[PDB]
Design a protein around this ligand. Sequence first.
Ligand SMILES: CCCCCCCCO[C@@H]1O[C@H](CO)[C@@H](O)[C@H](O)[C@H]1O
Ligand SMILES: CCCCCCCCO[C@@H]1O[C@H](CO)[C@@H](O)[C@H](O)[C@H]1O
Length: 335
Amino acid sequence: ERPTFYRQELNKTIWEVPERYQNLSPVGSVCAAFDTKTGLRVAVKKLSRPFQSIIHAKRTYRELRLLKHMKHENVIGLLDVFTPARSLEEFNDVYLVTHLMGADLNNIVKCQKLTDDHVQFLIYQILRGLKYIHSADIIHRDLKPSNLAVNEDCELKILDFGLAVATRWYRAPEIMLNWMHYNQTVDIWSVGCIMAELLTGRTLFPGTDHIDQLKLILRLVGTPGAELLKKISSESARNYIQSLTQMPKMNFANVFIGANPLAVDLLEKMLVLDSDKRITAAQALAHAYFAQYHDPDDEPVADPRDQSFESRDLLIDEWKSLTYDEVISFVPPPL
Ligand SMILES: CCCCCCCCO[C@@H]1O[C@H](CO)[C@@H](O)[C@H](O)[C@H]1O
Ligand SMILES: CCCCCCCCO[C@@H]1O[C@H](CO)[C@@H](O)[C@H](O)[C@H]1O
């Protein structure tokens, strides 16, 4: 079963991969390549210093376990995870493979004009992915147009977590403020931002820094009431924003002109300041805007994940060894 490998140097390091992967070419760290096995293009990444230390080794372990768990049409999946190591002593390097998708929301929104119909389809698919991820007790904290890949048949996948500045544009405000603990609806904020952009062709909130970012948000959704108070995040953050000048809530129908009234009704549930009042992925899926696609029996949740490890105090070589095993025991997606 063991594949045949080959070495090569690639920008200050040796890559040692199976020969089904041809024409490795870097974007770092990461390489794009072509899989002669599946006839498709792929992305390959080699972790750096997986086992730097107790801290890293265990994070490596947790991240790998998380990634092999991801099994959903709208979410990225492992094609392959391999080591050139033939045994534990020489075990230091881990390599990951997924499909290299073709296009992303960023580049398609730059040059095709979407209709209300395209948008429903697209956003449906993100929501479908989000719900799965969320169900897995995971918060993407970084959804954005370039995190969202699509292929020729218009299938969309979310990509950008547990792995790898050009945008605070999609960040929930509470993340601007350093809330230190987050609701999953942070992502929902990003989703409304992305939808607005797909509808209008342009960025909803193109701030040039953290503070300017808040100001733009406040110009659309309105200054909040004394729920400023329940931000003992930072007295000086609190005061700072209390100092801002006050803005009325804009009516979304008068901002998103020509849009499907169902679509405007959705944004208004997603672009809400209080994370406690944002609609969740699950509810968004049922919104009448998606009537054409909604199918409650076809919008699956993630299965239970065993996370015993997270508490155990292990030395580095124990952590390294639990990693070796997950490598060994990776079983590939069919076809
Ligand atoms: C469903 C997701 C895939 C993206 C589709 C690419 C954009 C197609 O093209 C769009 O089609 C509309 C009519 O259907 C036209 O009115 C628009 O002007 C045009 O930009
Ligand atoms: C820009 C000025 C207003 C700040 C945004 C309001 C805070 C968002 O919502 C807050 O998020 C927290 C979790 O993230 C929750 O624990 C809080 O209960 C909730 O109020």
